[PDB]
Design an enzyme around this catalytic site. Structure first.
Site, short mmCIF file in Angstrom:
data_model
loop_
_atom_site.label_atom_id
_atom_site.label_comp_id
_atom_site.label_asym_id
_atom_site.label_seq_id
_atom_site.Cartn_x
_atom_site.Cartn_y
_atom_site.Cartn_z
N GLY A 134 15.26 66.58 -42.97
CA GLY A 134 17.12 66.22 -43.54
C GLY A 134 18.13 65.27 -43.95
CE1 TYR A 147 7.44 59.70 -59.44
CE2 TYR A 147 9.50 58.57 -57.81
CZ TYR A 147 8.37 60.14 -57.92
OH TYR A 147 8.20 60.93 -57.11
CE1 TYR A 183 13.84 60.84 -35.36
CE2 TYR A 183 15.14 59.65 -37.44
CZ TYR A 183 14.14 59.61 -36.13
OH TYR A 183 14.79 58.49 -35.05
CG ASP A 200 9.02 60.31 -54.05
OD1 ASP A 200 10.26 60.72 -52.33
OD2 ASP A 200 10.01 59.86 -54.90
CG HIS A 215 10.42 60.65 -47.40
ND1 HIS A 215 10.98 61.36 -47.23
CD2 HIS A 215 9.77 60.11 -48.34
CE1 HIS A 215 11.33 61.28 -48.81
NE2 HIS A 215 10.58 60.59 -48.86
CG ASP A 216 14.80 59.58 -43.59
OD1 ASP A 216 13.97 60.88 -43.76
OD2 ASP A 216 15.36 60.34 -41.84
CE1 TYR A 269 12.05 58.58 -51.64
CE2 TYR A 269 14.01 59.35 -50.99
CZ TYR A 269 12.65 59.42 -51.34
OH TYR A 269 12.11 60.24 -52.38
N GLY A 287 19.40 62.06 -43.24
CA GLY A 287 19.96 61.51 -42.01
C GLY A 287 18.92 61.62 -40.98
CA LIG Z 1 16.16 62.72 -43.31
CA LIG Z 2 12.86 55.66 -64.39
#
Ligand SMILES: [Ca+2]
Ligand SMILES: [Ca+2]
Length: 123
Positions: A30, A73, A28, A99, A48-49, A52, A32
């Site tokens: 990287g 941000y 996982y 993040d 994290h994937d 997002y 994709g």
């Molecule tokens: Ca990934």
């Molecule tokens: Ca912004």
């Protein structure tokens, strides 16, 4: 944005090189990813994937001007601690947190070099 995520990782792990160490790792970490995670770090990236993916479906984020990779941000690093600013809007705030959680997860698990560049037959 990715360059801010890099800054967060540095805030937590000063000795790392984010874009190099956490790319092409496990099933996982990287661009994709799929299958069974090979270890704990691989699990942070799987999480994290998914974060997002959720952000790209958020109503407060404009299609594909406010994407996670290029949306800047406001945040600050204080004594190796990360803070997402209250001046941020709803979309910016959700991404900042994705993040932030990843940067922390990375700092709490072991790094196994033997899991770099694994072939897909192992996932
Ligand atoms: Ca990934
Ligand atoms: Ca912004």
């Amino acid at each position: 944005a990715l360059w801010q995520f890099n800054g967060m990782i540095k805030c937590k792990i000063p000795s790392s090189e984010p874009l190099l160490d956490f790319n092409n790792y496990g099933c996982y970490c990287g661009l994709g990813g799929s299958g069974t995670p090979v270890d704990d770090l691989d699990r942070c990236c799987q999480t994290h994937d998914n974060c997002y993916k959720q952000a790209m479906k958020l109503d407060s984020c404009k299609v594909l001007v406010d994407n996670p990779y290029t949306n800047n941000y406001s945040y600050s690093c204080s004594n190796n601690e990360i803070t997402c600013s209250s001046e941020n809007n709803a979309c910016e705030a959700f991404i900042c947190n994705c993040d932030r959680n990843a940067a922390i997860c990375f700092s709490k698990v072991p790094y196994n070099k033997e899991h770099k560049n694994l072939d897909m037959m192992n996932c």
